[PDB]
Design a protein around this nucleic acid. Sequence first.
RNA 1: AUU
Lengths: 300, 129
Amino acid sequence: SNSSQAWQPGVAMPNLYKMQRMLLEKCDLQNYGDSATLPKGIMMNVAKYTQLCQYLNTLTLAVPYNMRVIHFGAGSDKGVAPGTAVLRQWLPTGTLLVDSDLNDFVSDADSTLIGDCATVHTANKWDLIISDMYDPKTKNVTKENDSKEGFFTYICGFIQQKLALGGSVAIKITEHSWNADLYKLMGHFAWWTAFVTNVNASSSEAFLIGCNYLGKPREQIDGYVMHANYIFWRNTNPIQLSSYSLFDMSKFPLKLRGTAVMSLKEGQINDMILSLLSKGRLIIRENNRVVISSDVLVNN
Amino acid sequence: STVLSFCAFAVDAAKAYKDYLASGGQPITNCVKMLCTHTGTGQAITVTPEANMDQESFGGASCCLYCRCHIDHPNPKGFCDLKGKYVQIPTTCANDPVGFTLKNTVCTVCGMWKGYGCSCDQLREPMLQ
RNA sequence: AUU
Ligand SMILES: C[S@@+](CC[C@H](N)C(=O)[O-])C[C@H]1O[C@@H](n2cnc3c(N)ncnc32)[C@H](O)[C@@H]1O
Ligand SMILES: [Cl-]
Ligand SMILES: [Mg+2]
Ligand code: NA
Ligand SMILES: [Zn+2]
Ligand SMILES: [Zn+2]
């Protein structure tokens, strides 16, 4: 429990951990389940999304005008969307925000889709993907900690087909809620990390953050080894629960960079374009009418 | 034609909640309170949290009776003036944001709550250099 | 995972 990390919004996995070849084993946190002291009347997920956004502000996110953001797992047992309200607060005004969840809920997003994420279809590319999806049956550990293939297979497909080059992602994982292919896809970004919010340091939860999608593998990552590396980091680096970053919101809003959006063919992507994508200075996708929908199963 | 006739006579969700509160009923919970500096303009409904030191900022949709109860909004277009925005509630009333938005109206001139920030009806101030 |  390092005190220097307590004034940060959270802790990012050090690069040295990513270069190891660890064997998977149980995640055993010295402070498991402990609750942080939240500001009066602030929900855990408002605090958690606020710290995620505070960390995303320090990265090279592309922020174009008419930015397109999709938020998966935005619902809650409360029937409201705390995370979506924080994303809305964080994102520049005019940012297109669509959220989704298996269960109905009241949202501040421009549009809300109800149903399994596998039923969500779009003809458009997105600039930022946020996922807080977590399968309730993950709590029923019926076998070994293998790579999970429910909503994670959908997210991997969505990243490879619906994420604009230069786009970024923040996907929630835990010791048991993880996918080997998603870690492999972190190698398709200019940079990536596993970020732990300080308000939930007592959980194996982390956000796999992919910064600036390159549409191709910059590095070859073995997902089974990288998750073992993530658990090794969590097991040997206790993180002190802290809500200190929540008390200073003066630099919270994501700065509207007005990042250029261009529709280049795959035959035009070269070293200069890849270099611009890698610095958060370029988004590559068309700018057609945003079309999204959720399938409904028809039956008597 | 005869549905709007029945709706205009009995389904007045707004008054039902006011009576429910007067009956001792617990206010609608899980209104999403936002973290902010509390050094904002203090206006009623804004595109981003604008709470001053005497207010709390909440996600609009979570503070809308019509959104929360899954009922049509009381206006032809069925438009919501809270969803996608942030409502500033006086801290003294932050325990019931849904009830506060129903029982109060925004000043069309300054954009502040009437009786809680609007100073459009105060006496003429002597000019200041 | 929805302190
Ligand atoms: C921890 S809750 C999300 C909390 C939310 N992010 C908030 O701001 O409070 C996890 C959510 O993932 C959703 N989920 C799980 N599997 C899903 C799937 N296949 N498709 C869509 N949503 C899914 C659940 O319905 C649940 O609402
Ligand atoms: Cl600890
Ligand atoms: Mg926790
Ligand atoms: Na905003
Ligand atoms: Zn509403
Ligand atoms: Zn006024």
